[PDB]
Amino acid sequence: SKNPLLGKKRALLLSEPSLLRTVQQIPGVGKVKAPLLLQKFPSIQQLSNASIGELEQVVGQAVAQQIHAFFTQPR
């Protein structure tokens, strides 16, 4: 009795790779601005993953875009 290795298996796994720790390393967020932005955002995970509008408030629309795009699709 084995787990069937016969066949192609797709497994969408809910495994958060600790993106939140990398999300605070994004240029434009600002580790110094973190406690100030922490007044708006509960923690770094909501912080950098905040909507463009909220991120634009502290930096700019395009800066927000690079941050928000970063975790959406990185390389």
Residue type present at position 71: F
Distance from C-alpha of 74 to C-alpha of 57, rounded to nearest angstrom: 23
Specify the CATH superfamily of domain 1-75. 5' to 3' exonuclease, C-terminal subdomain (1.10.150.20)
Give CA–CA dist 75/72, Å, rounded. 10
- How many CB atoms lie under 10 A from the CB of residue 74? 9
Q: For residues 23 and 45, is the Cβ–Cβ distance under 8 A? A: yes
Measuring CA to CA, which residue among 16, 26, 74 is closest to residue 50?
A: 26
3-state secondary structure the chain: CCCCCCCCCCCCCCCCCCCHHHHCCCCCCCCCCHHHHCCCCCCHHHHHCCCHHHHHHHCCHHHHHHHHHHHHCCC
75 residue type, one letter: R
Domains in the chain: boundaries: 1-75
CA gap 59, 54 in Å, rounded: 9
